[PDB]
Amino acid sequence: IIRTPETHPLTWRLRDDKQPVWLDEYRSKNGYEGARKALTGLSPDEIVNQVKDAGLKGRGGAGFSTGLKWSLMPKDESMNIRYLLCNADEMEPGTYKDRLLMEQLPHLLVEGMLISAFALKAYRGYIFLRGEYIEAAVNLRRAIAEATEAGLLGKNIMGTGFDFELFVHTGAGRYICGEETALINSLEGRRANPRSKPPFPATSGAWGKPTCVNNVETLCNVPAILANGVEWYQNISKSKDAGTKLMGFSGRVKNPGLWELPFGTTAREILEDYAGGMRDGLKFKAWQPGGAGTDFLTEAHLDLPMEFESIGKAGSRLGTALAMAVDHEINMVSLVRNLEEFFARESCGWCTPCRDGLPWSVKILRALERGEGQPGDIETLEQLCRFLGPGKTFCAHAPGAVEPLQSAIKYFREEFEAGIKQPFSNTHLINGIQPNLLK
Amino acid sequence: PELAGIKDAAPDATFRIRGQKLAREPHRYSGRTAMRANISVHEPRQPQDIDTMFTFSMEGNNQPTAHRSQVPFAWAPGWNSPQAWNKFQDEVGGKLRFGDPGVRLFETSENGLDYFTSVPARFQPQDGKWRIAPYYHLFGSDELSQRAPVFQSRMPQPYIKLNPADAAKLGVNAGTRVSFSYDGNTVTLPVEIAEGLTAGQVGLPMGMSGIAPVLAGAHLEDLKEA
Amino acid sequence: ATIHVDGKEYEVNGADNLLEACLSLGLDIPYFCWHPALGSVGACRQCAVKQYQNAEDTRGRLVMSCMTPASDGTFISIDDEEAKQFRESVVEWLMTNHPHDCPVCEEGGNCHLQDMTVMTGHSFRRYRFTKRTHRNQDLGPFISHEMNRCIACYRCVRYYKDYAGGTDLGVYGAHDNVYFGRPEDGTLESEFSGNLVEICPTGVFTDKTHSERYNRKWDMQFAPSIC
Amino acid sequence: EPAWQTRDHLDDPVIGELRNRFGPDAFTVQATRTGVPVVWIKREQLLEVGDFLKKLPKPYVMLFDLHGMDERLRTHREGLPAADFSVFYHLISIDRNRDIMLKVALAENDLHVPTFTKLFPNANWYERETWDLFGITFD
Amino acid sequence: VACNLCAVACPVGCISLQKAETKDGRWYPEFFRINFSRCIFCGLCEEACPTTAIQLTPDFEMGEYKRQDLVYEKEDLLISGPGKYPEYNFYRMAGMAIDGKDKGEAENEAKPIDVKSLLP
Amino acid sequence: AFELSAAEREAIEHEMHHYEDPRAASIEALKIVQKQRGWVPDGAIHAIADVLGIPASDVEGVATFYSQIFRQPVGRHVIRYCDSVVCHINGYQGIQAALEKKLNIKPGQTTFDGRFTLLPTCCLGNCDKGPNMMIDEDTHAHLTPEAIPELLERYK
Numbered sequence A: 001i002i003r004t005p006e007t008h009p010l011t012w013r014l015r016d017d018k019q020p021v022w023l024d025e026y027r028s029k030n031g032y033e034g035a036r037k038a039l040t041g042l043s044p045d046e047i048v049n050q051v052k053d054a055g056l057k058g059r060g061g062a063g064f065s066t067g068l069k070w071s072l073m074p075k076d077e078s079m080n081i082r083y084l085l086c087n088a089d090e091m092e093p094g095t096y097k098d099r100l101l102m103e104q105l106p107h108l109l110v111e112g113m114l115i116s117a118f119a120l121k122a123y124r125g126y127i128f129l130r131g132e133y134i135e136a137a138v139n140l141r142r143a144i145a146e147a148t149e150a151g152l153l154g155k156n157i158m159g160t161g162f163d164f165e166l167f168v169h170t171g172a173g174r175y176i177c178g179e180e181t182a183l184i185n186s187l188e189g190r191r192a193n194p195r196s197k198p199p200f201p202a203t204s205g206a207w208g209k210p211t212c213v214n215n216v217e218t219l220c221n222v223p224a225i226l227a228n229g230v231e232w233y234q235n236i237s238k239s240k241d242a243g244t245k246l247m248g249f250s251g252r253v254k255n256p257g258l259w260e261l262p263f264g265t266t267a268r269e270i271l272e273d274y275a276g277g278m279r280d281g282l283k284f285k286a287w288q289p290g291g292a293g294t295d296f297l298t299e300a301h302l303d304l305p306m307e308f309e310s311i312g313k314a315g316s317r318l319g320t321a322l323a324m325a326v327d328h329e330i331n332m333v334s335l336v337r338n339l340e341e342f343f344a345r346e347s348c349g350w351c352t353p354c355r356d357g358l359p360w361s362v363k364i365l366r367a368l369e370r371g372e373g374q375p376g377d378i379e380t381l382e383q384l385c386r387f388l389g390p391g392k393t394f395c396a397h398a399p400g401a402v403e404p405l406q407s408a409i410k411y412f413r414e415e416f417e418a419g420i421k422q423p424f425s426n427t428h429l430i431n432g433i434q435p436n437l438l439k
Numbered sequence B: 001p002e003l004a005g006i007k008d009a010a011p012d013a014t015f016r017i018r019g020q021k022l023a024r025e026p027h028r029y030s031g032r033t034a035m036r037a038n039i040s041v042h043e044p045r046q047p048q049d050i051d052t053m054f055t056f057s058m059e060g061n062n063q064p065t066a067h068r069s070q071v072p073f074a075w076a077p078g079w080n081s082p083q084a085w086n087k088f089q090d091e092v093g094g095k096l097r098f099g100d101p102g103v104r105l106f107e108t109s110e111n112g113l114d115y116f117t118s119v120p121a122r123f124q125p126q127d128g129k130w131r132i133a134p135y136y137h138l139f140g141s142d143e144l145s146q147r148a149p150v151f152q153s154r155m156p157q158p159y160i161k162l163n164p165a166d167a168a169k170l171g172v173n174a175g176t177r178v179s180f181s182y183d184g185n186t187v188t189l190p191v192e193i194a195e196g197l198t199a200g201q202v203g204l205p206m207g208m209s210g211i212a213p214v215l216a217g218a219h220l221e222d223l224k225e226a
Numbered sequence C: 001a002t003i004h005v006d007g008k009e010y011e012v013n014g015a016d017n018l019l020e021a022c023l024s025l026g027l028d029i030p031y032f033c034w035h036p037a038l039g040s041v042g043a044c045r046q047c048a049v050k051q052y053q054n055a056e057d058t059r060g061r062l063v064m065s066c067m068t069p070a071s072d073g074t075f076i077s078i079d080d081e082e083a084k085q086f087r088e089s090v091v092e093w094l095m096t097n098h099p100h101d102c103p104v105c106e107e108g109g110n111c112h113l114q115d116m117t118v119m120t121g122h123s124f125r126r127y128r129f130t131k132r133t134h135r136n137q138d139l140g141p142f143i144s145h146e147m148n149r150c151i152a153c154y155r156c157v158r159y160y161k162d163y164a165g166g167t168d169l170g171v172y173g174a175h176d177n178v179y180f181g182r183p184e185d186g187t188l189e190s191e192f193s194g195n196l197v198e199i200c201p202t203g204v205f206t207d208k209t210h211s212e213r214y215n216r217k218w219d220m221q222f223a224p225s226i227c
Numbered sequence D: 001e002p003a004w005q006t007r008d009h010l011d012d013p014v015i016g017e018l019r020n021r022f023g024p025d026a027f028t029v030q031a032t033r034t035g036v037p038v039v040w041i042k043r044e045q046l047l048e049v050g051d052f053l054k055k056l057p058k059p060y061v062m063l064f065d066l067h068g069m070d071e072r073l074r075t076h077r078e079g080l081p082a083a084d085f086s087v088f089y090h091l092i093s094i095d096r097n098r099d100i101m102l103k104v105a106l107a108e109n110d111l112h113v114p115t116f117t118k119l120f121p122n123a124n125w126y127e128r129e130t131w132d133l134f135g136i137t138f139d
Numbered sequence E: 001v002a003c004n005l006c007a008v009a010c011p012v013g014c015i016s017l018q019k020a021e022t023k024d025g026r027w028y029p030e031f032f033r034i035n036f037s038r039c040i041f042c043g044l045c046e047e048a049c050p051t052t053a054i055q056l057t058p059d060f061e062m063g064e065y066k067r068q069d070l071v072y073e074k075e076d077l078l079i080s081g082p083g084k085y086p087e088y089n090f091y092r093m094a095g096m097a098i099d100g101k102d103k104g105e106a107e108n109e110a111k112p113i114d115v116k117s118l119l120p
Numbered sequence F: 001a002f003e004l005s006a007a008e009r010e011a012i013e014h015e016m017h018h019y020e021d022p023r024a025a026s027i028e029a030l031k032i033v034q035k036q037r038g039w040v041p042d043g044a045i046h047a048i049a050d051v052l053g054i055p056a057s058d059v060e061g062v063a064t065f066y067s068q069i070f071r072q073p074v075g076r077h078v079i080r081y082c083d084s085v086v087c088h089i090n091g092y093q094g095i096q097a098a099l100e101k102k103l104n105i106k107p108g109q110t111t112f113d114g115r116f117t118l119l120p121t122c123c124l125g126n127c128d129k130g131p132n133m134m135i136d137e138d139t140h141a142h143l144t145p146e147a148i149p150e151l152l153e154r155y156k
C-alpha cells in the first residue's frame, strides 16, 4: 500500500524498518515548510483562522474544533505569558497511536507545536508525556535538541524574533492526568485533580495564564494544513469531519495494527480489509470504537462510517477511533469487570459518585463473575449508569467508565443475568430479635 | 459615662421572647430525675436566674427566628451539627438575623492626634546588660490557660533565646543551662540559639512560670553559665 | 436577582450561588463539601438540584447548587423526584464504607453526616460487601483522629491549608484510599487546628479534651459567653 | 392519592354553601391533613356561621370539640390569618357523615370570643377549659 | 458503651450515666444509675439501646422501704451474662479499635490499605 | 537519616529552572530520588520539600497520588504487567500465573531475595502487540507463558 503525501499527510514519511526520522531526513521530505510559511508569511490570527476554517477537530476523542479553541484565547496584550501543552499522555486502554507518532516522527510534533505556539502567541510549550514512553521521550528530546541546534527552536526563530521554548515533562503513571485540567494540575506539581469549567484553560490555565492543551495527533495534523493549504485539507474526505485520522483494530484479529484513513471509512473495512478480520476459529461478538471509555457495539453497527456524528447517533462515541474487537470466547461480565476495575482504581478521588460507586460496581461484577450475584445487582448497575452520567460527576472519567457497562448490559444482558444465583441477603439473624419480614 | 455603652451590650433580665425566657439547654436534655439522685432521691429546686434573661432549664426559647442577638447554641430540627447556624443567620455566612451582639463603646473621633515627636535612639548593646526580648506563646503566656492540665503537654519547655554571637561570646552552646538574676533572684534555663534575635538581647518566654510579662523591655544582669 | 424554586418566586443576591441563596431562604438542600467561609468546590456532589432552562420546561438538568450562580430569572427544583433520588444515592454511596460507629463516636448527635443521611430519607442498606478501613494518626493533645468516618469532602484540607495557612495537613493517596491527615504522627502545628472539629462534618477530627469527659450535645447546658 | 395527603376540601358542599351564604371573602380555607375542611371565620361572624351550620338541610348537630391554641411561637403559619391565639370548633354532621373545623383568630390584647353555649350546650365546659388553660374570655 | 441513647430516650429522665474509656479505647459507663422510684417500666430505653446492654427482665418484686434505695447504681444493674440477647456484640460491628480487635477485624471490614502501598 | 546527594540536588534545581513555579518540579524531583535509590524513603519527602520550598504534606500527597512513585521499598527489578482490557483479551492471566509460579509471590509483593517486585499496571500503549509487560526500563510484547521463565533470567 503506497502512502502518497497527498492522501496520507501524517504517515507517508515513515520508514519501513520502524526507525525514527531525524532532522535531515525530515527536512529532506518537505520538513518545516509549513512552519516556515506560518512564521514568515502569515499573521498568528491568520493561522488561527486557517485552522478554524480547515475543519480540524480535536483528535483526543472529543472532536472539539481546534480553531474554535484557539480563538477563545484573550485578546489582551497584557497577557503576554502563554502556554501550549501537548497531551502525550495516551493512558486510555486500546490507544497506541501517539506512541507511533512520537517514536518515529518526533519532528512532525515539534513543527506542529512550533506553528501552534506562534499562532497562539504561546511563549512556552510543554509535552506532557507518560513515563512509560521511554523511547518516545528519548526521540522527542533528541529532536528538540536538533531543532534548537538548527535554530528552529529558542530565540529569534528563523529571523522572526518569536521566542519559543519547548520542554518534555514525563508523567508518573496516572490515567486521570490525560484530562486537560488534571493535566494542568499535574504540570504544576500538584495532585492531578481536574478543575471545574468555566473558567476554561484558554482564559486561565497553567499557572493562571492562558493555556491551550492539544493532542499529539491534532498538532501533527497542523503542519500539513499550514504547508498544503486549507482547501487541500477540506478535500481529503467528503464527510463532515475533515482530514485523515489514525484508525486501527486490536485484539485477536489477523493484523492488529494502526493505519491512517480518511474520515467516513466504515468499521468493516478497518476490521476486514486492513486488520484481516478475526483470527482462526473465533467469531465476532462486539467491538469498542474508541478505546476503553466507549460503548460496546455489535456486528450490526460494523457497517457504519467512523465519524463523530455517525457513532454518536449509534449510542457510542468515536473516541480515539482505535477499535477493539471482542470475540465469542471472551465473557462479557469478566471483560466489563476488568474495565471497571481499571476505571475504579484510576479514579482521582475528588467526587463521590465515581470514587464510591465504581468500587460498588466492581464488587457487583466480581460477585457476578463467581456466580455469587444476588437480585438487585443489575438494577444497582443500571442505577449507577444513570447517576454517573454527564453533569453528575465532577469530570468525564466516570461517564466514560459507565458507558461500556451500560452498553454490555443493553446488548448482553443474558450473561449478566446468568451470574445471579444466590438470594439477596444483607443481614444475619440476631437471636432474640424477630426480623421485619418485608414482603 | 465612658462605659455607658455597656447597658446596651445585652438586654436586661426582664427581656422575654413572647413572654418566655431563653433556654440554656436543649429540648431533649436528659437525666433530670437521676443526675442528682445519688445525693438525694428528691429532685432539687431548679436554679433561679435573677441576673439574666436566660433560664437554667429547657423551659425557654431557642428558636432561630426569635428576636434576639444572644444565642446560647445553634439547633434546628433536622440540623443538629454546627450547620444550624445557617438557620440562625439572616443570610448564610453573614450576620445574625437580628444583629450581632455587642456594642462599640466609642465612635471614630472627629479630629485626630498630633504626631508623636519623641523618636527613640537606636538600640545599643551595653556590656553586662541584656535587653529582654518578649517571646509570646499561645499555649503558656495567658495566665489562666497555663492552669489547664491539657496545656502542659502542649506548652513548650521554657528555654532562653540567645544570638549566636552572644552565645559564642559567653561560651555556651545550645541546650546548656545558664543562670541569671532578676530582682535579686537567680533562675536557670537552657539555651536555644536564635539566629534572628539581635545581639545584645536575650529572649524570654513571657507569662511562663516564674517569668512575668512585666519583664518585657527590662534588662538582665550577670547572665552566665551555671 | 429572581429565582423560582418549586413554583415559588424568591428575591436573592445575584452574587451568591444557588446553595447559599436557597439556604438563606430557609430551604433545605443537603450539602457536604461547601462551607460559607471556604467557598464552593463541587466535590461531594450532594447539593444536586434540577435546573430548567425556562418556565415551560419539563426535562431540566441536574446541577450542583453550590457551583451554580443564583442569577436573575433562574428556575430550579429541590424536591424534584430525580434530584431527590440522586441526593439519596450520594448519601448511600457515602454510607457504603462508613463504620458502624455512632454509639462510640463523639460526633453522634452533633453530626452533619447523620443529619444529611436522615434528611435525604436513606435508611435502608442494600450494600453487602466489605467496608474500607484506615489506621489513625496521633495528632497531638487537642485533636483526635479517626479516618474510618471520612467521607472525603475535602473541607479539612481546604480550611487548614487555604484558609488557615497551615502546612502539616494534607490529602494523600488515590481513588477511594484518600487519607486526610499529617505526613507523619505529631502535633498539628496550626494555632487554629481546633476549628477542624467543627469544619469536619463527620467524627474524623474530634475534641480530645471534650472526649475525655464526653457527653452528647443534647445533655449540655450552654450559655453565650466571651472567651 | 394517599389518605394522608394535604387537602383543602374545597369540593365539600359545605364550603360552597358557606360561600353562597356569607360571600367568598368572609372566610379562609386552610389546607391540612386533618381530613376535614378547616375554615377560618371572623370573630364577629362566628355565631352567624354556627347558626347557618345548625340550620342546614343535613345539619351539623354536634359540637365535637372546642378549644384554643397559642399561636405566638408558631413559625410556619403560611396561608393562615394573623393570630396570637386561636379558638377552634369541631362540628359533626351525622346525616352527611362529615365534619368541619371553624377557627377564630384572636389578638393578644383582645382575647374574647362570643360564647357558643346558646347553640351547643357542651360549649359550657369546653369554654371553661379554654378560659382556664389559655385565658380566653367567652362573652 | 455509654452512648447515652437510653438516657435521652427515657421520657421520665431517670437514667444518668457518664462515658469513660479504658486504655485500649473501648467506651464503658463510669457510673450508671437508674431512679426506679421514677421509672415507668415502658421499655423505651431497651428499645433505644444499640448494643442490647440495657434490658427489661421478667422481675416485678422491687418493693422497698426507703425511696433512696430505689436509686440503683451500676453494681445493682450489671449482671453476669447476656440476658435476653445471647450473642449480639456491638464491638464486632464497630469500626473503632479495641483490645483484641484491630482495624479491619470487625464484621464486613477490609484490612486497611496504606497510601504508601505499591498497588495502583 | 536522609541526605540528598549533590547530583540529586543539582538535577532537582535544574528541573526547577524549567518552570515559573518551583512546585512544578515535585514529580520530577521524586522521580530523580526514585531513580537514584529505587524508591522514595521517608526523609526524602522532607528533603524535597526543603529544596523546593513547599510543605512536606504537598510532596507526600503528590508521592502517594502517583502509582509510579514508590513510597515503600521495592526489589532490584520491578516487573509491571499490563492487566487492562486489550491484554485481557490477549490473555495476560497466563502471564500473571506464570509470573506468580516462577517468583512464588503475589502482585504487590517482592521476592525473598529482593530481586523482583511484581506489580500490575495500567495500559502500556502497546495494545496491538499484547500482552505487554514492563521490566525496569524495557517493555516486552507478544508474551507467552513459556517465554516468561526464559525472559526472567536475563535480569540478574
Ligand SMILES: NC(=O)C1=CN([C@@H]2O[C@H](COP(=O)(O)OP(=O)(O)OC[C@H]3O[C@@H](n4cnc5c(N)ncnc54)[C@H](O)[C@@H]3O)[C@@H](O)[C@H]2O)C=CC1
Pocket: A058, A059, A060, A061, A062, A064, A069, A072, A090, A091, A092, A095, A178, A179, A180, A200, A201, A202, A213, A293, A317, A319, A320, A395, A396, A400
Ligand atoms: N486517550 C485519550 O485521548 C482519551 C480521550 N478521551 C476523550 O475525552 C473526552 C472528554 O474530554 P473533556 O476535556 O473531559 O471534555 P470536553 O469534550 O468538554 O472538552 C474537550 C475539549 O473541548 C474544549 N472545549 C469544550 N467546550 C469548550 C468551551 N465552551 N470553551 C472552551 N473550550 C471548550 C476543551 O477545552 C477541551 O480541550 C471524551 O469524550 C473522550 O472521547 C477520554 C479518555 C482518554
Ligand SMILES: Cc1cc2nc3c(=O)[nH]c(=O)nc-3n(C[C@H](O)[C@H](O)[C@H](O)COP(=O)(O)O)c2cc1C
Pocket: A057, A058, A059, A060, A061, A062, A063, A064, A065, A066, A087, A088, A089, A090, A091, A092, A175, A176, A177, A178, A179, A180, A181, A213, A214, A215, A216, A218, A395, A396, A397
Ligand atoms: C478521563 C480523561 C482522560 C483523558 N486522557 C487523555 C489522554 O490521555 N490524551 C489526550 O490527548 N486526551 C485525553 N483526554 C481528553 C482531554 O480532556 C482533551 O480533550 C485533550 O487532551 C485535548 O483536546 P483535543 O482533542 O482538542 O486536542 C482525556 C479526557 C478525560 C475525561
Ligand code: SF4
Pocket: A176, A194, A346, A347, A348, A349, A350, A351, A352, A354, A355, A393, A394, A395, A396, A397, A398
Ligand atoms: S469522576 Fe470525580 S473522582 Fe472520578 S476522576 Fe473525575 S473528578 Fe475524579
Ligand code: SF4
Pocket: C098, C099, C100, C101, C102, C105, C106, C107, C108, C109, C111, C112, C113, C114, C149, C201, C202, C203, C204
Ligand atoms: S461520623 Fe457521624 S455518621 Fe459517622 S459514626 Fe460518627 S456520628 Fe455516626
Ligand code: SF4
Pocket: C149, C150, C151, C152, C153, C154, C155, C156, C157, C180, C199, C200, C201, C202, C204, C205
Ligand atoms: S476528614 Fe472530615 S473534613 Fe476532611 S475530607 Fe474527611 S469528612 Fe471531610
Ligand code: SF4
Pocket: E009, E010, E011, E012, E013, E014, E015, E034, E038, E039, E040, E041, E042, E043, E044, E045, E046
Ligand atoms: S423503662 Fe424506665 S428507665 Fe427505661 S425509658 Fe422507660 S421510664 Fe426510662
Ligand code: SF4
Pocket: C103, E001, E002, E003, E004, E005, E006, E007, E017, E045, E048, E049, E050, E051, E052, E053, E054
Ligand atoms: S445502656 Fe445502651 S443505650 Fe444506654 S448508654 Fe449504654 S449502650 Fe447506650
Ligand code: FES
Pocket: C030, C031, C032, C033, C034, C041, C042, C043, C044, C045, C046, C047, C064, C065, C066, C067
Ligand atoms: S456542596 Fe455542592 S457538591 Fe458539595
Ligand code: FES
Pocket: A093, A094, A095, F082, F083, F084, F085, F086, F087, F088, F122, F123, F124, F125, F126, F127, F130, F131, F132
Ligand atoms: S491494554 Fe495492555 S498495552 Fe494497552
